[PDB]
């Protein structure tokens, strides 16, 4: 063949197989992340797996804060994830400097995604093998959830997942939105945790998951403590 | 087959070995042998020169970088000349700026950085030359070797070039006495050491030997064909 | 290597004889043979339409359900056509050998580049070796015909009750006639293909490396 | 093995095969034609795009005006054609800015051909897969027709065709063209004849061709595109003449 | 049993296994295509000679310039690519004149040879300048000049390595011409003897019979400047042989 | 193997792409040059009119300056570029040193340009060889030749392009001090040499002369017809 | 062979085959339809979503370059956005220079020049997207197509994407120049109705129109009203 | 399969194999370990003595990248020295601009991003070094970080790199570093290195140790030789 092995060249069917391989690179990590939106809150959950006891559990995280009121969860290569996180923080601060107001979540996602496009069009560099999911509150639009992928697609979502169990998780979430009644903050967090736990079969403990939330009442992105996570987990088991 | 993974420096091998760097390290073996050894008060460089023909003069194997530093080369004369120019300019810059002789350790660190840059990037080849750097500074006499790989060592004594293992074993078995030697004893030891490398038919001569001495009171001086006769006369014979 | 004047003379004599014979062959002998084989296949004998004309009597006494076989001749038609064909196939093999040797002597000193001319020489050599193998196949099958037919008639005489051997003898004759007409067609085609390829690529064949360069060296 | 790549390697026997492969491309293109006459010069082209749902919004799909005093028709890749025409217009206007006179036709052709040669010689860029005809009037040499190729080589022609069936067009023009005797009307009739011969369509639609003429009237060049009624009249006249020639036999 | 894979010879900046860097070696093979040149160093001076290898009679003999003048004190003889030879000769000339400008003195033959050698080294492309030929210089030079140390003959090769040589031969018949040099040469020989011996060796190696047209000869002596033997002087010596 | 890049040397040290460009020169139309005592004549064959083409656009012989002219055999576009570059260099040299260019200077410049294109990959050699003619300040006739490799050589007389071998053999036979004695004899010599390799005599040769202190003159077709008639009659 | 992989290499028979492959990439893109009515021009495309989870308001396949120009695409989504940003920037540069809204023909020329600019360099790939650029200028409608090749054409009506040939045949059967846009939007949704392989709804399609007023994306309620027929 | 030739490439199954091949580089290296305790961080390296000729205190794998931080490396020593120069430049720039000693987490992030730059581009290979960084500041506390060739960075209570990583990691795991103090941790580091050293394959080693902590007033420094000798004697005694 040879139509793979370079991002620039098109297949005879015009598919650009290299970026599709970058999509597989996300699943190679073996972790899953889920994001679900609510009427007044947006949450991100992801597996936290510590391979060795010696590792400091505090340092390992896939949840990062792009700015005070935006948070992200990265899935894929850890290094590419950290690099994209840094680029996102730079883009947000530069937006604030130039335009005088906090970057919208959609525009941040668009900037990061079009950067991913310049990666998937120029020859020498490779697409970053990571996926981003951004959550924030916009005053006009309420909560928001968005996802960047290695291709440059940046579509917004009511709820999403990324990682190895993405298809199972989106099947689960699709059923839940179809039986739409609402999602308050507690139900939002419960839906996220139930989705992740059901698709993985994990039956989590508080250490195994890390959750981050935004709410219209408290717009700042915060990563909940193990105690708060256990509080939500116990509520799930009780009912 | 594994002809692949050998084409360029920028390709890692499936067992974590950059084969072009090793192929460059083979280059030092091609050149005529060199030996360097030090005492508490002196550092010595001695070399075996080669000639294209009887009519041709023997090549220059010892080069003076500064009063306090000089080098001897094994491997490509081109890379040797280039690196010697770089070292000379660095020492001149140190004397101009700080009005002090450059530390020999710092100079070999600079050589290591400059040599390392080719290995990692596509383009320029690794410097396929091995140098023995000998100098006196305030800390004391010093001898270093630099490989075509940018790694460098500090040595009590060392020999580089073709058939240098014989000189290395002679030096190792005789090393203890070197530290307290006179300069005449030390140069004689080094001459015997390089005599080990020669073919059995060949013997040391005024022509094919060059000696380089530096010390507390002695600036780097290369004793040429006529001037090596005082040092050579002491040596007895082949065993 | 040191060469005597006599040695140089002998080698130059072989070389000049080969070159002039190749020129004469391709320019004169090939057209003549092309038309000769063309008219030969146009001949009525090669264009026999009813194959039962070709089949010849085998006087094997059919066994009555409950004495000896007379001399069983070879098929006159097939053996006459073979007498015509055999000179042509052997002649073609000889001429292909000559062409091979001519091109090989024209192959120049081995060299790193400007090897496109020698590549052309190698390609035409590939073609001439191919036709050489083909004519060798013709040469072996002509003998296979006689051996097979003799075995067949011996079997038919030995086992009179089997009529399939008699049908086989007739079939061998018919297949032989078909093979022979295809053979003369192929011989003419090989002569023509040799002419075409050699004439088309003669410049690079005779002078592969080409005219002398300006000599930047 | 392969000496046809990178457009910078002379193959053995010294041939640049990338430019030859590019010259192969123009043959696929819609036929374009140019004829030189005593009173004027014309460009005629076959609008290869004959899709039903296409709009003739532009001045012309194939014919471009480069300057007040000249025009061009293009056969080859349309994108490279657009680039080359933009470069041509800039070159002409640069000459007008510098010397305050109209660009000579040969000079403009030579400049663009220098660009096209340059793209052949340097490694990264491909040769321009375009061949285009230039028509213009200049004070030095009057009416002129020029042809160019991907190689960057140009020549002056009394009449020539580029594109599909260019060999048939040139064969027809060779017999028909009368040196020193053409007028714009006769050249238009010849253009219709050779286009009808080359084009596969039995009847030239008069929407499947675009004809433009360059003439000097009142000391100023005019480049005009014959309108659909005019070319309809031309094909009607040619059909009548050819039928009458048929009727006599 | 033949192993001909090479697969590393192509492309400079590739160390082959055993670290041999074969492009430079092939460039060193390239000078054997060139016409044979010969140099002998003596106390009375250094002489340079070369076979012109005239292709056709119509070509002007003077135009072939395989021995040239870097300056009055130094001359060069070259074998290999004429074009990159011209480049290196230009570098030598400009460096000599730069030295005169800056220090009001004449360069030594060793310093001039080092100057051109530095340019030859740049095939490695360590410098970022675009205007340096990627290929090694396919030429070998013989630098002969009288300096503060007296007559000196330096040899330069495509690698950029350089050495003094009492007598050297470059070009096609350098193998065998060097053996003849080794047997004939003795340090005491005068320039007349050196001229005669070098012309003997050139006559031996040259395919065509030696004539004033097909050789170029030069000498630089301590008192004199670089001098080329004219047609008449060449006639006298080739008659004397 | 070793013929795909200009930079790479071959085993035995042959650079083959430049050889291929020198081969490309052989494809081109023939050109011939001869040095008369007071004339330099430059003759070039003409491929064909094609009967719908204007001859003025195609001219192999060109004047770099008042005192120098060239003819080429090889890629026509490359020849045009090289001619323009040499012309601007001629005027620039006059600008710089207030003197007219010497023939050896301009052939050196053209050779240096061709050499510059050979040395570096990413650029292909100019597929041309040229015959440069001029009169120097002393008034001596000069003829030089250049090739894609970048070497230049003076020639008493030479040819380039297709049939160069045959015509130069003829010229090696014919050329002598006697032939150069007359300007008409020089013109007739070059015409006979081109007649050695050309389909037809008058139609297919374009010829030009430079005199001691006159500009280039392309001989009229009638003059060429008269000269070939004189040549034809003598036989 | 080697012609397949390189973008600056003419294949034998003179084909730049990587560009043909980019056009094949366009053909795989979702259906898009453009019909130029007398008083307007309608751009329509399917916005079929993988799941209900997708929020339709987040992204649009039909985008305005200017007040009076808008465009739609079939092909690669990221490439579409690169060039839509570049098109908006080019139009604003035109407005700065000339203080007039850019003509549709000029804008399509400029974006096609950009697309051609990308094809020449080997280090880059062609844009794997084609566009239908519609506009209303000088009291006239316009519709244009710009391909990955860098070429542009003017269509009365056309279709891109999956089943573009069949859609074009359906259009040429159904197309009348006298159509008003009220009818033309119906014809466009029918042209897409040929090729959905699903039950079209207000969400599953995105459609926009241009007229003397300017370009606009008619809302989900509007397209529901038009779909009701 | 041409997927493994370059780092720009992806495998069809989503793996960048050049980076993994570079990760295999460090395993060739002799082991090095760093342990973090309450007082500070201790580093140790098993520096194999290739020849008697080589001077002691040469081929140092423990570098000081700033006064308050030290670096221990495994993998290619050339790449490691270059990475140390990069880290020193980053620390100096941080001091010059922001006016105080660089936080270790930030320094690890910056050098990790510099490393991660190389995995992306085709022109340049990934680094062949994996290195540990450690510092103590009264504000931040004891911090130990490890950077792989990929540019992944994490904080480790205990860490090992090189050939004997796994065995060293289990030995470190059975230690309870959090409660312990540095002057004991040096002894246990010596014990672990002596355990993991293979006498048959590796002829001899010279233990190279360093620490940073409150006992230094927050300066990374080489161990005093008396403490080195005490720890080495303890390690030899425990080895049995």
Q: Got the DSSP string for F128-181?
A: EEEEEEEE-TT--EEEEEE-TT--EEEBSEEEESTTHHHHHHHHHHH--TTGGG
Q: A26 and chain H: CB distance < 8 Å anywhere? A: yes
The distance from CA D54 to its chain's CA centroid, rounded to whole angstroms, is 22
Q: Burial code of F172-206, b = ≥16 C-beta within 10 A, e = fewer? A: eeebeeebbeeeeebbbbbbbbbbbbbeebbebbb
- Closest approach of F5 to chain D, Cα-based (Å): 7
Give the span between the Cα atoms of G77 and G82, in whole angstroms. 9
Token digits of residue F186: 């020089």
CB contact under 8 A, D122 and F53: no
Residue A17's contacts (CB-CB under 8 Å, 6 or more residues apart) are A3, A4, A11, H12
Token digits of residue C27: 């320019």
The CATH code of the domain that includes E131 is 3.60.20.10
Q: Is G146:G115 a contact under the CB 8 Å cutoff?
A: yes
Looking at the DSSP bridge assignments, the partners of residue B62 are B72
For chain E, the chains sharing at least 3 beta-carbon pairs closer than 8 angstroms are B, C, F
Residue C2's contacts (CB-CB under 8 Å, 6 or more residues apart) are none
Give the span between the Cα atoms of C86 and D185, in whole angstroms. 72
In angstroms, the first-to-last Cα distance of chain C is: 27
Three-state secondary structure along chain C? CCCCHHHHHHHHHHHHHHHHHHHHHHHHHHHHHHHHHHHHHHCCCCCCCCHHHCCCCCCCCCCCCCCCCCCCCCCHHHHHHHHHHHHHHHHHHHHHHHHHHHHHHHCCCCCCCCCHHHHHHHHHHHHHHHHHHHHHHHHHHHHHHHHHHHHHHHHHHHCCCCCHHHHHHHHHHHHHHHHHHHHHHHHHHHHHHHHHHHHHCHHHHHCCCCCCCCCCC
Which domains can be identified in chain F, with CATH numbers? 16-234 (3.60.20.10)
Q: Is E79:E205 a contact under the CB 8 Å cutoff?
A: no
Residues of B in contact with H53 (CB under 8 A): 155-158, 168, 171-172, 175
Q: How was this structure determined?
A: cryo-EM
| G71, G75, G78, G80 alpha-carbon torsion, rounded to 10° | -20
Give the span between the Cα atoms of A134 and G186, in whole angstroms. 39
Give the span between the Cα atoms of C83 and A142, in whole angstroms. 103
CB contact under 8 A, H16 and A126: yes
Residue D239's contacts (CB-CB under 8 Å, 6 or more residues apart) are D203
Residues of A in contact with G18 (CB under 8 A): 9-10
Chain D: residue whose CA lies nearest to F54: D156
The chain H residues in contact with chain A (CB within 8 A) are 2-3, 7-16, 105, 109, 112-113, 115-116, 119-123, 145, 150-159, 169, 172-173
Q: Which of residues 105-144 of C touch D (CB under 8 A)?
A: 114-116
Chain H: residue whose CA lies nearest to A129: H14
Q: D174 and chain F: CB distance < 8 Å anywhere? A: yes
CB contact under 8 A, A114 and G58: no
Q: B115 and chain H: CB distance < 8 Å anywhere? A: yes
| Phi, psi values for residue D216, rounded to 5° | -105, 115
CB contact under 8 A, F56 and D13: no
Q: Burial code of F121-132, b = ≥16 C-beta within 10 A, e = fewer? A: bbebbbbbbbbb
Say which of F1, F8, F121 has its CB closest to residue E23: F8
- Closest approach of F166 to chain C, Cα-based (Å): 11
**Cβ pairs bridging A and G (under 8 Å):** 109
Q: Is B69:B135 a contact under the CB 8 Å cutoff?
A: yes
Domain assignment of residue E64, yes or no = yes
- Closest approach of F141 to chain D, Cα-based (Å): 32
Give the span between the Cα atoms of A40 and E231, in whole angstroms. 105
In angstroms, the first-to-last Cα distance of chain D is: 57
Touching status, chains A and H (3+ beta-carbon pairs under 8 Å): yes
Give the span between the Cα atoms of D172 and D190, in whole angstroms. 9
- Identify the CA nearest to F71 among candidates F23, F17, F34, F114: F34
In angstroms, the first-to-last Cα distance of chain E is: 50
Q: Which of residues 87-116 of G touch D (CB under 8 A)?
A: 105, 109, 112-113, 115-116
Give the span between the Cα atoms of G162 and D181, in whole angstroms. 56
Helix/strand/coil for E153? strand
- Identify the CA nearest to H32 among candidates H184, H179, H134, H135: H134
Q: What is the DSSP letter of B121?
A: B
- Closest approach of E187 to chain B, Cα-based (Å): 10
Residue with tokens 């020029």: D146
Could you tell me where the DSSP H helices lie in E104-172?
Answer: 109-121
Resolution in Å equals: 2.9
Residue C126's contacts (CB-CB under 8 Å, 6 or more residues apart) are none
Q: What is the DSSP letter of E147?
A: E
Chain C: residue whose CA lies nearest to E30: C217
Q: DSSP string covering B81-117, please?
A: HHHHHHHHHHHHHHHHHHSSPPPHHHHHHHHHHHHHH
Q: How many residues in total does chain F contain?
A: 235
- Closest approach of C120 to chain F, Cα-based (Å): 17
Token digits of residue A23: 């999509």
Alpha-carbon distance values, E157 to B15, D184, E161, E198, F58 (Å): 39, 70, 6, 21, 46
CB contact under 8 A, C113 and F150: no
Residues of H in contact with B111 (CB under 8 A): none
Number of domains present in the structure of chain C: 1
CB contact under 8 A, C113 and F19: yes
Using a 10 angstrom Cβ sphere, with 0-12 exposed, 13-18 middle and 19 or more buried, the burial of residue F66 is: middle
Using a 10 angstrom Cβ sphere, with 0-12 exposed, 13-18 middle and 19 or more buried, the burial of residue G51 is: middle
Using a 10 angstrom Cβ sphere, with 0-12 exposed, 13-18 middle and 19 or more buried, the burial of residue B72 is: buried
Q: DSSP string covering chain D, please?
A: ----STT--PPTTS--HHHHHHHHHHHHSPPEEEEE-SSEEEEEEE-----TTB---SS-SSEEEEETTEEEEEEE-HHHHHHHHHHHHHHHHHHHHHHSSPPPHHHHHHHHHHHHHHHHHBSSSPPP-EEEEEEEEETTTEEEEEEE-TTS-EEEESEEEESTTHHHHHHHHHHH--TTT--HHHHHHHHHHHHHHHSSSSS--SSSEEEEEEEEETTEEEEEEPPHHHHHHHHHHHHHHHHHHHHH-
Q: Is F179:F191 a contact under the CB 8 Å cutoff?
A: no
Residue with tokens 């407005």: G95
Identify the residue among F4, F13, F113 best suited for mutation to test binding to E, counting E beta carbons within 10 A and taking the highest. F13
Helix H or strand E segment including E12: none
Alpha-carbon distance values, D134 to A68, B214, D70 (Å): 64, 79, 7
CB contact under 8 A, G53 and A13: no
Say which of F6, F144, F157 has its CB closest to residue E58: F157
CB contact under 8 A, A8 and G57: no
Q: Is G7:G149 a contact under the CB 8 Å cutoff?
A: no
Which domains can be identified in chain D, with CATH numbers? 17-248 (3.60.20.10)
Q: Burial code of D9-29, b = ≥16 C-beta within 10 A, e = fewer? A: bbbbebbbbbbbbbbbbbbbb
Q: Is F11:E29 a contact under the CB 8 Å cutoff?
A: yes
Give the span between the Cα atoms of A15 and A117, in whole angstroms. 15
Residue D219's contacts (CB-CB under 8 Å, 6 or more residues apart) are none
Give the span between the Cα atoms of B162 and A6, in whole angstroms. 44
| Phi, psi values for residue B66, rounded to 5° | -155, 175
Q: What is the DSSP letter of H164?
A: T
- Identify the CA nearest to F120 among candidates F232, F2, F8, F234: F8
Q: B149 and chain H: CB distance < 8 Å anywhere? A: yes
Token digits of residue D166: 């260019």
Residue A173's contacts (CB-CB under 8 Å, 6 or more residues apart) are A34, A36, A159, A160, A161, A191, A195, G53
CB contact under 8 A, G18 and A10: yes
Residues of E in contact with F158 (CB under 8 A): 58-59
Say which of E10, E63, E135 has its CB closest to residue F154: E63
Q: Is B72:B52 a contact under the CB 8 Å cutoff?
A: no
Helix/strand/coil for H42? strand
Residue with tokens 């050339």: H78
Token digits of residue B99: 């009005």
Helix/strand/coil for B154? strand
Q: E181 and chain B: CB distance < 8 Å anywhere? A: yes
CB contact under 8 A, A28 and H15: yes
Residues of C in contact with E80 (CB under 8 A): 217
Helix/strand/coil for F86? helix
In angstroms, the first-to-last Cα distance of chain G is: 52
Number of neighbouring beta carbons within 10 Å of residue B139: 9
* Domain map (residue ranges) of chain A: 1-239
Give the span between the Cα atoms of G58 and C193, in whole angstroms. 71
Give the span between the Cα atoms of F145 and B115, in whole angstroms. 46
Chain F: residue whose CA lies nearest to C114: F16
Number of neighbouring beta carbons within 10 Å of residue B80: 24
Token digits of residue H99: 């006016």
Beta strands in F2-121 (DSSP E): 31-35, 40-45, 53-54, 62-63, 68-74
Residues of A in contact with H113 (CB under 8 A): 82-83, 86
Give the span between the Cα atoms of C174 and C182, in whole angstroms. 13
Q: What is the DSSP letter of A172?
A: H
CB contact under 8 A, D159 and F52: yes
Secondary structure tally for chain A: helices H, strands E: 6, 9
| Domain span holding position E218 | 22-240
Domain G2-228 has CATH 3.40.50.970: no
Looking at the DSSP bridge assignments, the partners of residue G133 are G71, G144
Q: Is F129:F31 a contact under the CB 8 Å cutoff?
A: no
Helix/strand/coil for B77? helix
Q: E163 and chain B: CB distance < 8 Å anywhere? A: yes
Interior angle at CA D184, CA D183 and CA D185, nearest 5: 95
Residues of D in contact with G11 (CB under 8 A): 21
CB contact under 8 A, F158 and E59: yes
**Cβ pairs bridging A and H (under 8 Å):** 99
């Amino acid at each position: 063949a040879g139509f793979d092995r370079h991002i620039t060249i098109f297949s005879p069917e015009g598919r650009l197989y290299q970026v599709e391989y970058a999509f597989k690179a996300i699943n190679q990590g073996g972790l899953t992340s889920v994001a679900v939106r609510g009427k007044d809150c947006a949450v991100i959950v992801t597996q936290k797996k510590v391979p060795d006891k010696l590792l400091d559990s505090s340092t390992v995280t896939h949840l990062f804060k792009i700015t005070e009121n935006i948070g992200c969860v990265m899935t894929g290569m850890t290094a590419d994830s950290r690099s994209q996180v840094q680029r996102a923080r730079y883009e947000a601060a530069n937006w604030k400097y130039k335009y005088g107001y906090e970057i919208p979540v959609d525009m941040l996602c668009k900037r990061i995604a079009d950067i991913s496009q310049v990666y998937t069009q120029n020859a020498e560099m490779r697409p970053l093998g990571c996926c981003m999911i951004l959550i924030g509150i916009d005053e006009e639009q309420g909560p928001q959830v968005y996802k960047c992928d290695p291709a440059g697609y940046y579509c917004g979502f009511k709820a999403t997942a990324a990682g190895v169990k993405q298809t199972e998780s989106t099947s689960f979430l699709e059923k839940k939105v179809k039986k739409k009644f609402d999602w308050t903050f507690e139900q939002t967090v419960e839906t996220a945790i139930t989705c992740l736990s059901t698709v993985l079969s994990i039956d989590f403990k508080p250490s195994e998951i890390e959750v981050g939330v935004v709410t219209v009442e408290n717009p700042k992105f915060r990563i909940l403590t193990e105690a708060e996570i256990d509080a939500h987990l116990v509520a799930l088991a009780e009912r | 087959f594994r002809n692949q993974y050998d084409n360029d420096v920028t390709v890692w091998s499936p067992q974590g070995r950059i084969h072009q760097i090793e192929y460059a390290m083979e280059a030092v073996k091609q050149g005529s042998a060199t030996v360097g050894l030090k005492s508490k008060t002196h550092a010595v460089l001695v070399a075996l020169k080669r000639a294209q023909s009887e009519l041709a003069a023997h090549q220059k194997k010892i080069l003076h970088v500064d009063n306090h530093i000089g080098i001897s080369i094994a491997g490509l004369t081109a890379d040797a000349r280039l690196l010697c120019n770089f070292m000379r300019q660095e020492c001149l810059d140190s004397r101009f700026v700080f009005d002090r002789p450059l530390p020999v350790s710092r100079l070999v660190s600079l050589i290591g950085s400059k040599t390392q840059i080719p290995t990692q990037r596509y383009g320029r080849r690794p410097y396929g030359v091995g140098l023995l750097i000998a100098g006196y500074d305030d800390m004391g006499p010093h001898i270093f070797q630099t490989c075509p790989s940018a790694n460098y060592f500090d040595c009590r004594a060392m020999s580089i070039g073709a058939r240098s293992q014989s000189a290395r074993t002679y030096l190792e078995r005789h090393m203890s006495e070197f530290m307290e030697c006179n300069l005449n004893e030390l140069v004689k030891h080094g001459l015997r050491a390089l005599r080990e490398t020669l073919p059995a038919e060949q013997d040391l001569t005024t022509k094919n030997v060059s000696i380089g001495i530096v010390g507390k009171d002695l600036e780097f001086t290369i004793y040429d064909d006529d001037d090596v006769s005082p040092f050579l006369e002491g040596l007895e014979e082949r065993p | 290597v040191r060469l005597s004047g006599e040695a140089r003379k002998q080698v130059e004599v072989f070389r000049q004889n080969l070159f002039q014979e190749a020129e004469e062959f391709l320019y004169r002998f090939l057209p003549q043979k092309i038309i000769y084989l063309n008219q030969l296949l146009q001949e009525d004998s090669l264009n026999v339409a009813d194959l039962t004309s070709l089949r010849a009597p085998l006087d094997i006494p059919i066994p009555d359900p409950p004495h000896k076989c007379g001399f069983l001749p070879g098929n006159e038609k097939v053996l006459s056509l073979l007498a015509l064909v055999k000179p042509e196939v052997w002649t073609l093999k000889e001429k292909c050998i000559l062409v091979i040797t001519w091109i090989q002597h024209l192959i120049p000193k081995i060299e790193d580049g400007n090897d496109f001319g020698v590549a052309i020489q190698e390609k035409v050599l590939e073609r001439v070796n191919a036709v050489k193998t083909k004519v060798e196949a013709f040469q072996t099958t002509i003998s296979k015909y006689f051996s097979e037919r003799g075995d067949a008639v011996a079997k038919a005489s030995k086992e009179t009750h089997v009529m399939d051997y008699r049908a086989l003898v007739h079939e061998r004759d018919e297949a032989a006639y078909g093979e022979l007409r295809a053979m003369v067609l192929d011989l003419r085609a090989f002569y023509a293909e040799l002419y075409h390829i050699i004439s088309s690529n003669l410049e690079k064949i005779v002078n592969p490396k080409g005219e002398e360069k300006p000599s930047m060296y | 093995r392969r000496y046809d790549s990178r457009t910078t390697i002379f193959s053995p026997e010294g041939r640049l095969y990338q430019v030859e492969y590019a010259m192969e491309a123009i043959g696929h293109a819609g036929t374009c034609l140019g004829i030189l006459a005593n009173d004027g010069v014309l460009l005629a082209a076959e609008r290869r795009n004959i899709h039903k749902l296409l709009d003739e919004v532009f001045f012309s799909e194939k014919i471009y005006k480069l300057n007040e005093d000249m025009a061009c028709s293009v056969a080859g890749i349309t994108s490279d054609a657009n680039v080359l025409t933009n470069e041509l217009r800039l070159i002409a206007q640069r000459y007008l800015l510098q010397y305050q006179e109209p660009i000579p036709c040969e000079q403009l052709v030579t400049a663009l051909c220098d660009i096209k040669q340059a793209y052949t010689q340097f490694g990264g860029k491909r040769p321009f897969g375009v061949s285009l005809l230039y028509i213009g009037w200049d004070k030095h040499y009057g009416f002129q027709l020029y042809q160019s190729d991907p190689s960057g080589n140009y020549g002056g022609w009394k009449a020539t065709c580029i594109g599909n069936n260019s060999a048939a067009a040139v064969s027809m023009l060779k017999q028909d063209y009368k040196e020193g005797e053409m007028t714009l009307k006769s050249a238009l009739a010849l253009a219709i004849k050779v286009l009808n011969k080359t084009m596969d369509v039995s009847k030239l639609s008069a929407e499947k061709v675009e004809i433009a003429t360059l003439t000097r009237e009142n000391g100023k060049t005019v480049i005009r595109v014959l309108k659909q009624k005019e070319v309809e009249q031309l094909i009607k006249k040619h059909e009548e003449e050819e039928a009458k020639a048929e009727r006599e036999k | 049993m033949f192993l001909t894979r090479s697969e590393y010879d192509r492309g400079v900046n590739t160390f082959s296994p055993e670290g041999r860097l074969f492009q430079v070696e092939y460039a060193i093979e390239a000078i054997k295509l060139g016409s044979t040149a010969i140099g002998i160093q003596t106390s009375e001076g250094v002489c340079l000679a070369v076979e012109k290898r005239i292709t056709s009679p119509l070509m002007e003999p003077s135009s072939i310039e395989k021995i040239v003048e870097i300056d009055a004190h130094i001359g060069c003889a070259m074998s290999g690519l004429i074009a990159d030879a011209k480049t290196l000769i230009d570098k030598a000339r400009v460096e000599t004149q730069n030295h005169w400008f800056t220090y009001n003195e004449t360069m030594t033959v060793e310093s001039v040879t080092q100057a051109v050698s530095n340019l030859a080294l740049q095939f490695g492309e360590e410098d970022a300048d675009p205007g340096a030929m990627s290929r090694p210089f396919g030429v070998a030079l013989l630098f002969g000049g009288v300096d503060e140390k007296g007559p000196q003959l330096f040899h330069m090769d495509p690698s950029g390595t350089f050495v003094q040589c009492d007598a050297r031969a470059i070009g096609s018949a350098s193998e065998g011409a060097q053996s003849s040099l080794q047997e004939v040469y003795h340090k005491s020989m005068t320039l007349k003897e050196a001229i005669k011996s070098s012309l003997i060796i050139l006559k031996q190696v040259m395919e065509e019979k030696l004539n004033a047209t097909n050789i170029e000869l030069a000498t630089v002596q301590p008192g004199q400047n670089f001098h080329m033997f004219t047609k008449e002087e060449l006639e006298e010596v080739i008659k004397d042989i | 193997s070793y013929d795909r890049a200009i930079t790479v040397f071959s085993p035995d040290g042959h650079l083959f792409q430049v050889e291929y460009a020198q081969e490309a020169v052989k494809k081109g139309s023939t050109a011939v040059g001869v040095r008369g005592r007071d004339i330099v004549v430059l003759g070039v064959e003409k491929k064909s009119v094609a009967k719908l083409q204007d001859e003025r656009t195609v001219r192999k012989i060109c004047a770099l300056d008042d005192n120098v002219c060239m003819a080429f055999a090889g890629l026509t576009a490359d020849a045009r570029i090289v001619i323009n570059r040499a012309r601007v260099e001629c005027q620039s040299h006059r600008l710089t040193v207030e003197d007219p260019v010497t023939v050896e200077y301009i052939t050196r410049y053209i050779a240096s340009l061709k050499q510059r294109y050979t040395q570096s990959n990413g650029r292909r050699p100019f597929g041309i060889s040229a015959l440069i003619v001029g009169f120097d300040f002393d008034g001596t006739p000069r003829l030089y030749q250049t090739d894609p490799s970048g070497t230049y050589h003076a020639w008493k007389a030479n040819a380039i392009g297709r049939g160069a071998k045959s015509v130069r053999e003829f010229l090696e036979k014919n050329y002598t001090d006697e032939a150069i004695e007359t300007d008409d004899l020089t013109i007739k010599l070059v015409i006979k040499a081109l007649l050695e390799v050309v389909q037809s005599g008058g139609k297919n040769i374009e010829l030009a002369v430079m005199r001691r202190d006159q500009s280039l003159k392309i001989l009229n077709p009638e003059e060429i017809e008269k000269y070939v008639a004189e040549i034809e009659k003598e036989k | 062979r080697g012609y397949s992989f390189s973008l600056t290499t003419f294949s034998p028979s003179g084909k730049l085959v990587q560009i043909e492959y980019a056009l094949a990439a366009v053909a795989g893109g979702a259906p898009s339809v453009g019909i130029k009515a007398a008083n307007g021009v309608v751009l329509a495309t399917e916005k079929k979503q993988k799941s209900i989870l997708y929020d339709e308001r987040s992204v649009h396949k039909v985008e305005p370059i200017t007040k009076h120009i808008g465009l739609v695409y079939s092909g690669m989504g990221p490439d579409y956005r690169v060039l839509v940003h570049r098109a908006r920037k080019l139009a604003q540069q035109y407005y700065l220079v000339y203080q007039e809204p850019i003509p549709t023909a000029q804008l399509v020329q400029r974006v096609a020049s950009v697309m051609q600019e990308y094809t020449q360099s080997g280090g880059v790939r062609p844009f794997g997207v084609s566009l239908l650029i519609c506009g209303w200028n000088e009291g006239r409608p316009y519709l244009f197509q710009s391909d990955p090749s860098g070429a542009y054409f003017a269509w009365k009506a056309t279709a891109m994407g999956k089943n573009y040939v069949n859609g074009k045949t359906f259009l040429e059967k159904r197309y009348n120049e006298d159509l008003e846009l009220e009818d033309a939007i119906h014809t466009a949704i029918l042209t897409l109705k040929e090729s959905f392989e699903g039950q079209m709804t207000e969400d599953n399609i995105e459609v926009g129109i241009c007229n003397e007023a300017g370009f606009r994306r008619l809302t989900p309620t509007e397209v529901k009203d038009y779909l009701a027929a | 399969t041409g997927y493994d030739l370059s780092a720009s490439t992806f495998s069809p199954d989503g793996r960048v194999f050049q980076v993994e091949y570079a990760m295999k580089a460090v395993e060739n290296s002799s082991t090095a370990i760093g342990i973090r305790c309450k007082d500070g961080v201790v580093f140790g390296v098993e520096k194999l003595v290739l020849s008697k000729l080589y001077e002691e205190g040469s081929n140092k794998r423990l570098f000081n990248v700033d006064r308050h931080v030290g670096m221990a490396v495994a993998g290619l020593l050339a790449d490691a020295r270059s990475l140390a120069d990069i880290a020193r430049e980053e620390a100096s720039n941080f001091r010059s601009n922001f006016g105080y000693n660089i936080p270790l987490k930030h320094l690890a992030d910056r050098v990790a991003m510099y490393v991660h730059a190389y995995t992306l581009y085709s022109a340049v290979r990934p680094f062949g070094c994996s290195f540990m960084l450690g510092s103590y500041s009264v504000n931040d506390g004891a911090q130990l970080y490890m950077i792989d060739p990929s540019g992944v960075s994490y904080g480790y209570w205990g860490c090992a790199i090189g050939k004997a990583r796994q065995a060293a990691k289990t030995e470190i795991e059975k230690l309870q570093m959090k409660e312990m103090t540095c002057r004991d941790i040096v002894k246990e580091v010596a014990k672990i290195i002596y355990i993991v050293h293979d006498e048959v394959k590796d002829k001899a080693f010279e233990l190279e140790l360093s620490w940073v902590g409150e006992l230094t007033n927050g300066r990374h420094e080489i161990v005093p030789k008396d403490i080195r000798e005490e720890a080495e004697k303890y390690a030899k005694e425990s080895l049995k």
